[PDB]
From Swiss-Prot, chain A:
Gene3D superfamilies: Ribosomal protein L30, ferredoxin-like fold domain (3.30.1390.20)
Gene (UniProt): rpmD
Protein name according to UniProt: Large ribosomal subunit protein uL30
The species this protein was found in: Escherichia coli (strain K12)
Note: This protein is located near the guanosine triphosphatase center of the 50S subunit.
CDD domains attached to this UniProt entry: Ribosomal_L30 (cd01658)
Organism lineage: Bacteria, Pseudomonadati, Pseudomonadota, Gammaproteobacteria, Enterobacterales
SUPFAM superfamilies: Ribosomal protein L30p/L7e
Source superkingdom: Bacteria
Swiss-Prot record, chain B:
GO molecular function: peptidyl-tRNA hydrolase activity; ribosome binding; translation release factor activity
Biological function: Rescues stalled ribosomes. Can hydrolyze peptidyl-tRNA on ribosomes stalled by both non-stop mRNAs and mRNAs that contain rare codon clusters or ribosomes stalled in the middle of mRNA. First identified as a complementary ribosome rescue system when the stalled ribosome cannot be rescued by the SsrA(tmRNA)-SmpB quality control system or the alternative ribosome-rescue factor A (arfA).
Location of the protein in the cell: Cytoplasm
Keywords assigned by UniProt, alphabetized: Cytoplasm, Hydrolase, Translation regulation
Protein name, per record: Peptidyl-tRNA hydrolase ArfB
Subunit structure as annotated in this protein's UniProt entry: Associated with 70S ribosomes and polysomes.
Source organism per UniProt: Escherichia coli (strain K12)
Family recorded in the similarity comment: Belongs to the prokaryotic/mitochondrial release factor family.
UniProtKB/Swiss-Prot annotation, chain C:
Segments passing through the bilayer: none
Database matches in PANTHER family: RIBOSOMAL PROTEIN L25/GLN-TRNA SYNTHETASE, ANTI-CODON-BINDING DOMAIN-CONTAINING PROTEIN, RIBOSOMAL PROTEIN L25_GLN-TRNA SYNTHETASE, ANTI-CODON-BINDING DOMAIN-CONTAINING PROTEIN
Record-level GO cellular component terms: cytoplasm; cytosol; cytosolic large ribosomal subunit
Swiss-Prot/TrEMBL keywords: Ribonucleoprotein, Ribosomal protein, RNA-binding, rRNA-binding
Self-association and partners: Part of the 50S ribosomal subunit; part of the 5S rRNA/L5/L18/L25 subcomplex. Contacts the 5S rRNA.
A Pfam family per the record: Ribosomal_L25p
Protein name (database record): Large ribosomal subunit protein bL25
GO molecular function: 5S rRNA binding; structural constituent of ribosome
Organism: Escherichia coli (strain K12)
Source taxon at top rank: Bacteria
Gene that this sequence comes from: rplY
UniProtKB/Swiss-Prot annotation, chain D:
Annotated NCBIfam families: L27
Family recorded in the similarity comment: Belongs to the bacterial ribosomal protein bL27 family.
Disulfide bonds: none
One GO BP: cytosolic ribosome assembly
Xref: InterPro entries: Ribosomal_bL27, Ribosomal_bL27_CS
One Pfam family in the UniProt entry: Ribosomal_L27
Protein name from the UniProt record: Large ribosomal subunit protein bL27
Keyword Disulfide bond: no
Record-linked SUPFAM superfamilies: Ribosomal L27 protein-like
Gene: rpmA
Amino acid sequence: AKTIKITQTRSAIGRLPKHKATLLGLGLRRIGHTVEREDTPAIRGMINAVSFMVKVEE
Amino acid sequence: ISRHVAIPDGELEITAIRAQGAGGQHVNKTSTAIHLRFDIRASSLPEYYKERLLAASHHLISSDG
Amino acid sequence: MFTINAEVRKEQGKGASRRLRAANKFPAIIYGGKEAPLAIELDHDKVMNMQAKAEFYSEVLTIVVDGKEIKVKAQDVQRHPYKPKLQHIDFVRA
Amino acid sequence: RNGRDSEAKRLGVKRFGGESVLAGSIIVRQRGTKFHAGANVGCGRDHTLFAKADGKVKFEVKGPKNRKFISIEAE
Amino acid sequence: MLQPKRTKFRKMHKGRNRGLAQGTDVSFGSFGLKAVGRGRLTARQIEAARRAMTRAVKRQGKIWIRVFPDKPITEKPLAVRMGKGKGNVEYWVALIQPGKVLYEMDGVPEELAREAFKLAAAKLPIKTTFVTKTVM
RNA sequence: UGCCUGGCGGCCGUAGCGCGGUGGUCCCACCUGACCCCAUGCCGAACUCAGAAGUGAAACGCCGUAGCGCCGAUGGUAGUGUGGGGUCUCCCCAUGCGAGAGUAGGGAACUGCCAGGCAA
RNA sequence: GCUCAACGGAUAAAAGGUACUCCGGGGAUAACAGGCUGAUACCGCCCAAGAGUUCAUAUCGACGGCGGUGUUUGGCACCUCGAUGUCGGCUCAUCACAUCCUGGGGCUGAAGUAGGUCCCAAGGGUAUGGCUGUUCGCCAUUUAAAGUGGUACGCGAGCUG
RNA sequence: UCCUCCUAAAGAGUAACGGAGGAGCACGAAGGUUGGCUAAUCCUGGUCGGACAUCAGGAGGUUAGUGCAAUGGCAUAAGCC
RNA sequence: GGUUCUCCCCGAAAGCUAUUUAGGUAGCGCCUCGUGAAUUCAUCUCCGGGGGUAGAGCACUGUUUCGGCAAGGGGGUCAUCCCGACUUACCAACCCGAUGCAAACUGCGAAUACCGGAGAAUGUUAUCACGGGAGACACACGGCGGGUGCUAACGUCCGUCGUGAAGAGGGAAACAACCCAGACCGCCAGCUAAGGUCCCAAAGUCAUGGUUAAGUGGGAAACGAUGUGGGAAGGCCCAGAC
């Protein structure tokens, strides 16, 4: 449950609804978004799918 | 007795020229598919018959064969 | 009678297997009995010529991993389809 | 020169294993009888295995010939 | 050509051609002609090489054609419109994957066996390679 | 209880088959007769009754046997979700998932309830 | 009580012709042409038994294969159906080279003369008539040769019909 | 128009003038229930009987059969009497 | 075919079914508005599930090659009319071992996808029911899995996702559909994406180590060749090799 910052690098336009909804599940809205969450396989699993377009900041 | 039509592929020159007659504008633009043959006497091979096919007069075959 | 030096692996899967196959190395596996199957990585170039000798498939080896020498026997081989090269060799720990 | 067909008759499992069904709930809609009726599961004229009691579903494989059975535990 | 006697069907799908080959090993002979590429060997092609291969060795030795076409692929009669069902079966092709050994030979010394396959390679469309058997 | 047999379940080819040996107070099968209950689209074989001298070949159980079937790693390979790339009729790279086949090896069961037997 | 099988059945009903045709629309959908492809056609090449007195490669080359060009016939309908006049001849041509002649060379199963084949080369030249509407083609006779194709298979706001 | 398999990319579903075959019924019994039975094809011997007649034994094993097209399924038989 | 003033907000489809229907229409799916409702709904972790496709395999439905074996029909010395002695150089299955193929084969079997439950976080409730009003039902292309086609097409027909359709801006010279990326407005402000940094044209004639002689880069195959670099191995080798 450690505080962890999540960065949005790329834009989600040519992605699947499964990957687009994952961003909605993490609150990532626009390019250059830094939101602080917590760690657990449920949360990190979301980052695990679209780690190509998001940057992690532990 | 044993009859199978040969007619050698790669030995017969087929010439596609336009047609003749009536039938509209269709008959004079894309009627080039009509066929005209070209079977030279040099592709004989029986040695005796082809010259007997040339000497005796008939149409479809000119004075040269 | 084969001086086949080898190193114990640390990454044993699909992705890491080919990264060393591009670096002139191929994995093997020494197994036999109650002991644990030791993941072995060896240099490809050498054994590519060692199996030219016919008695290589019927005699004991002098394979050494980390100083200690293990006596084994060649079990079977999975070669590459069209390129005449080795991929993975099954070793029965004798 | 044949070109004929048939509109598919919707087979399969409508209520999967692990869900609590009601009495008379169709569990598996099967053309053949691959699945065989277990506890509180009935077999119709089209061998469609449906529910009898109320509860969750268990896809228990039993029998010497290992045919697949479905039963319903009171849950 | 080599036509399979009494097939179950007449015409089928063209399928897809990808994947490696099974017969990587060399059995029943001493040397073989493994296929590197991945292409379509028609019946007339396979027939052509095998006839021309025994011509080189001069009747000594035996041949093992470890394949068979058995896949009918059609063709439409020229100048016909795309439709009205499948055309008639024209030839027989076998899908050759990378690593498939085509012809084999034993009872013949290496060098003469070497040129026979080399002259059998020029009849084929796909890129091949030479292969030697090995014990285990 | 060490073992026995018979019945009924769980697990349901590691559990099952072929071969060789072997068991009978008890149990089971075979076996005796079948004018009576019943039975054969002919027939006491199957079916059933009344007995059971005799036997342990058969059947079944048990032990050995892998002579067969079966079970099946570790590793590698095929394939592949997702994000990129190339020479893009097919493949490569990062990463997650990960066979089938085959090898070593295991392996000719285990367990519960009940009823009397056995030396209690 | 309906093969109301055009089977959610319009209602038994009902065959056709239109080049005498007319009207409303469409390149959603055809003919010519252009575009994409290159199955076919044409051209080049790989391999090679055999023919060639001897000899595979002087000259051809089966059995099979790999490519190119976009000229034949086609596949697809992407453009035009509130218009793109379509064959051939006349006239005027222009370009490409896979070259018919002239020129420069290799080889030859090139003795000489005369030829076969291949490479380089597009500057110039590259028939008159009979027959048919014909392109094509056949023929008579010349010529150093009477090349092959692109150019809406050039050219009808230039002509003939 | 309806039915089965495949295409259909492991839920369902999914088109083509795509690939293969059938239906426009049958039956008072082939339906229901009870009890019994459960093979096909080969090897061997035996009256005519030999390629397959019937019976007997054995191997084998559900490749049988199921009023029919195909698929799935079936002996705890939905198979046979 | 045409349909005239303005601003703001949300925002499609070109699919299924039926149609004397296929350029039309109706219902549903999708859209909008109003209203009422359940932590209702989506992503992820875990758990509980059946599927049989890719692949693979070859007992089964068929199919294929080779080897060992093998009765029967026949050829023959013959019965020299059947029977019958023998061989089988012959067609040579049935069976055993070994080798492959399959949309319409399965003694096996994923990844994803899909259904149900539980838990956290996020999302102006994105889920569903009811009522008004619609439009639309001719889609295109690219990636992937496929049929047809010639494993041709800017071809045609389906599943699925993105995009265009109804999205400009930057790049691919130009270029809807390719890549990056979602325009409320103003600024002579800065930092990055794909792509690039000699000049045309904004940015390094950047740093280090190698490579090519062809202007390769800047269209392409089978095939041929002492082009040439790198790596490994083998033959002979100052009892002197080429």
